[PDB]
Design an enzyme around this catalytic site. Structure first.
Site, PDB file in Angstrom:
ATOM      1  N   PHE A  73      27.607  11.142 -34.742  1.00 27.10           N
ATOM      2  CA  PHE A  73      27.429  11.361 -33.313  1.00 27.10           C
ATOM      3  C   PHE A  73      28.415  12.389 -32.790  1.00 27.10           C
ATOM      4  O   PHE A  73      29.612  12.298 -33.085  1.00 27.10           O
ATOM      5  CB  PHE A  73      27.672  10.022 -32.572  1.00 27.10           C
ATOM      6  CG  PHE A  73      27.514  10.153 -31.088  1.00 27.10           C
ATOM      7  CD1 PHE A  73      26.248  10.112 -30.501  1.00 27.10           C
ATOM      8  CD2 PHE A  73      28.624  10.341 -30.273  1.00 27.10           C
ATOM      9  CE1 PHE A  73      26.092  10.302 -29.126  1.00 27.10           C
ATOM     10  CE2 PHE A  73      28.474  10.517 -28.896  1.00 27.10           C
ATOM     11  CZ  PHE A  73      27.210  10.494 -28.331  1.00 27.10           C
ATOM     12  N   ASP A  77      25.709  18.890 -26.571  1.00 26.55           N
ATOM     13  CA  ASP A  77      24.950  19.948 -27.263  1.00 26.55           C
ATOM     14  C   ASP A  77      25.196  21.280 -26.587  1.00 26.55           C
ATOM     15  O   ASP A  77      25.667  21.343 -25.450  1.00 26.55           O
ATOM     16  CB  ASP A  77      23.438  19.640 -27.428  1.00 26.55           C
ATOM     17  CG  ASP A  77      22.642  19.589 -26.139  1.00 26.55           C
ATOM     18  OD1 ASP A  77      22.589  20.604 -25.441  1.00 26.55           O
ATOM     19  OD2 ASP A  77      22.027  18.542 -25.864  1.00 26.55           O
ATOM     20  N   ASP A 118      14.260  26.049 -37.437  1.00 31.21           N
ATOM     21  CA  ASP A 118      14.062  25.783 -36.009  1.00 31.21           C
ATOM     22  C   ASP A 118      15.373  25.689 -35.232  1.00 31.21           C
ATOM     23  O   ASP A 118      15.592  24.770 -34.427  1.00 31.21           O
ATOM     24  CB  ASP A 118      13.155  24.568 -35.786  1.00 31.21           C
ATOM     25  CG  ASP A 118      12.635  24.471 -34.359  1.00 31.21           C
ATOM     26  OD1 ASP A 118      12.529  25.537 -33.681  1.00 31.21           O
ATOM     27  OD2 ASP A 118      12.377  23.344 -33.902  1.00 31.21           O
TER      28      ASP A 118
HETATM   29  N1  LIG Z   1      25.987  15.597 -22.777  1.00 26.75           N
HETATM   30  C1  LIG Z   1      25.703  14.447 -23.370  1.00 26.75           C
HETATM   31  O1  LIG Z   1      25.838  13.346 -22.830  1.00 26.75           O
HETATM   32  C2  LIG Z   1      25.173  14.530 -24.811  1.00 26.75           C
HETATM   33  C3  LIG Z   1      24.357  15.569 -25.253  1.00 26.75           C
HETATM   34  C4  LIG Z   1      23.906  15.577 -26.576  1.00 26.75           C
HETATM   35  C5  LIG Z   1      24.214  14.518 -27.436  1.00 26.75           C
HETATM   36  C6  LIG Z   1      23.644  14.521 -28.850  1.00 26.75           C
HETATM   37  O2  LIG Z   1      22.521  14.992 -29.035  1.00 26.75           O
HETATM   38  N2  LIG Z   1      24.399  13.952 -29.806  1.00 26.75           N
HETATM   39  C7  LIG Z   1      24.037  13.867 -31.113  1.00 26.75           C
HETATM   40  C8  LIG Z   1      22.860  14.068 -31.747  1.00 26.75           C
HETATM   41  C9  LIG Z   1      23.142  13.851 -33.049  1.00 26.75           C
HETATM   42  C10 LIG Z   1      22.259  13.887 -34.319  1.00 26.75           C
HETATM   43  C11 LIG Z   1      21.149  14.953 -34.385  1.00 26.75           C
HETATM   44  C12 LIG Z   1      20.791  13.472 -34.173  1.00 26.75           C
HETATM   45  N3  LIG Z   1      24.446  13.553 -33.169  1.00 26.75           N
HETATM   46  N4  LIG Z   1      24.953  13.544 -32.023  1.00 26.75           N
HETATM   47  C13 LIG Z   1      25.005  13.472 -26.972  1.00 26.75           C
HETATM   48  C14 LIG Z   1      25.458  13.473 -25.662  1.00 26.75           C
END
Ligand SMILES: NC(=O)c1ccc(C(=O)Nc2cc(C3CC3)[nH]n2)cc1
EC number: 2.7.11.22
Length: 289
Positions: A73, A77, A118
Site C-alpha cells: 500500500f 497516486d 498501460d
Molecule cells: N490520496 C489517497 O487517499 C490515495 C490515492 C491512491 C491510493 C492507492 O491507489 N494506493 C495503492 C494502490 C496500490 C496497489 C495497486 C493496487 N497500492 N497502494 C491510496 C490513497
C-alpha cells in the site's frame, strides 16, 4: 479472504475494485485488487519481479472464480498529486527524481522482457520518502486492455503509443517509454500532452504536434494495419512551444522518448544515462495525508 478486513474503497481499477485492507495475521495494511490458467501462471511470475520502483505484489489468491491480488500500500497516486499541485506545479527537481526512478523501474522490468502496456498517472504511486512506484506491471498481458472498465468507465487513450493506435499486434518495450514521455510532459506543463477522446482523435492529436509520420521518419509506417493514406499531413511543432519551461536537456530527452519509430525511441537504460539526469536528487514531496 477471511484473513483481510477492508478499511475503505481506494478506487476502481481497469479490472476491478481496489480496497485498502488489513491482514489479520501480520497486522499488515495492503491494497487488495478484486479481479483462466494462463493468467494464474503469468501473475505468479510477477511475484518474483521485485524492484524498489515496482509496487510489491505480496500474494495472489484464487478462490470461487475470483482472483485477488494483494499489493504493498502507498498513500497517494501521481494523478491526484498532479491535481493537488495544479496551482504551483510539481517542482522541477521532484519531476526529475520521479522520471529517473520510473526509468529505473522500466529498465528493470524491460530487462526481464516484461512490459507494462498501460502506464498512466493513476498507476504511479508515491510515498512520503520521495519514492515513486509503478503499479499494475504485467496485468495487461494477463487480462488484456479493454475499451471500458468493469464499471463502464472509459479506459484512457492519452498515453497510448502510436504503433498501438496504428494496429501493431506485437509491440515492444518502447510502448512504455512513449507513455512515460507523455507523463513527463504533463508533469512539466500541468496539462495532458495528447488528451484524445477516441482512437482517431488520439492519433490526430499526436500528428498535429509531432507531424504526420511518413516513411522518412518511420520506415514501414504506411504499411501498418490501421494506417490510411487519407490521413491529413500536419507539420511538426518545436518542443520549445510544446513543453516550456523545460530546459534543453529535458526537451532533447523528451524528443527521444517520443520518436515515432519504436526502434529509434530511447530505451529506459539509455535514458538513465542522459545528461538531463546529471544533477538528479531525491527531494521529499509535500504530502498531506
Ligand atoms: N490520496 C489517497 O487517499 C490515495 C490515492 C491512491 C491510493 C492507492 O491507489 N494506493 C495503492 C494502490 C496500490 C496497489 C495497486 C493496487 N497500492 N497502494 C491510496 C490513497
Amino acid at each position: 479472504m477471511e484473513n483481510f478486513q477492508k478499511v475503505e474503497k481506494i478506487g476502481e481499477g481497469t479490472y476491478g475494485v481496489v480496497y485498502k485492507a488489513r491482514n489479520k495475521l501480520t497486522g499488515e495494511v495492503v491494497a487488495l485488487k478484486k479481479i483462466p490458467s494462463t493468467a494464474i501462471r503469468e501473475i505468479s511470475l510477477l511475484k518474483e519481479l521485485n524492484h524498489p520502483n515496482i509496487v510489491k505484489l505480496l500474494d495472489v489468491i484464487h478462490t470461487e472464480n475470483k482472483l485477488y491480488l494483494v499489493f504493498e500500500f502507498l498513500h497517494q497516486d501521481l494523478k491526484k498529486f498532479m491535481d493537488a499541485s495544479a496551482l504551483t506545479g510539481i517542482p522541477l527537481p521532484l519531476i526529475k527524481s520521479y522520471l529517473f526512478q520510473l526509468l529505473q523501474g522500466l529498465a528493470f522490468c524491460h530487462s526481464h522482457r516484461v512490459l507494462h502496456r498501460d502506464l498512466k498517472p493513476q498507476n504511479l504511486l508515491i510515498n512520503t520518502e520521495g519514492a515513486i512506484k509503478l503499479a499494475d506491471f504485467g496485468l495487461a498481458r494477463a487480462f488484456g486492455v479493454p475499451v471500458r472498465t468493469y464499471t463502464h468507465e472509459v479506459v484512457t487513450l492519452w498515453y497510448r503509443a502510436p504503433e498501438i493506435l496504428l494496429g501493431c499486434k506485437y509491440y515492444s518495450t518502447a510502448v512504455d517509454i512513449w507513455s512515460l514521455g507523455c507523463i513527463f510532459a504533463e508533469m512539466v506543463t500541468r496539462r495532458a500532452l495528447f488528451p484524445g477522446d477516441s482512437e482517431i482523435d488520439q492519433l490526430f492529436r499526436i500528428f498535429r504536434t509531432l507531424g504526420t509520420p511518413d516513411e522518412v521518419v518511420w520506415p514501414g509506417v504506411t504499411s501498418m494495419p490501421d494506417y490510411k493514406p487519407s490521413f491529413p499531413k500536419w507539420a511538426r511543432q518545436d518542443f520549445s512551444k510544446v513543453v516550456p519551461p523545460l530546459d534543453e536537456d529535458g526537451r532533447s530527452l523528451l524528443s527521444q522518448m517520443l520518436h515515432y519509430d519504436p526502434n529509434k525511441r530511447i530505451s529506459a537504460k539509455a535514458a538513465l544515462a542522459h545528461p538531463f539526469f546529471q544533477d538528479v536528487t531525491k527531494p521529499v514531496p509535500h504530502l498531506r495525508l
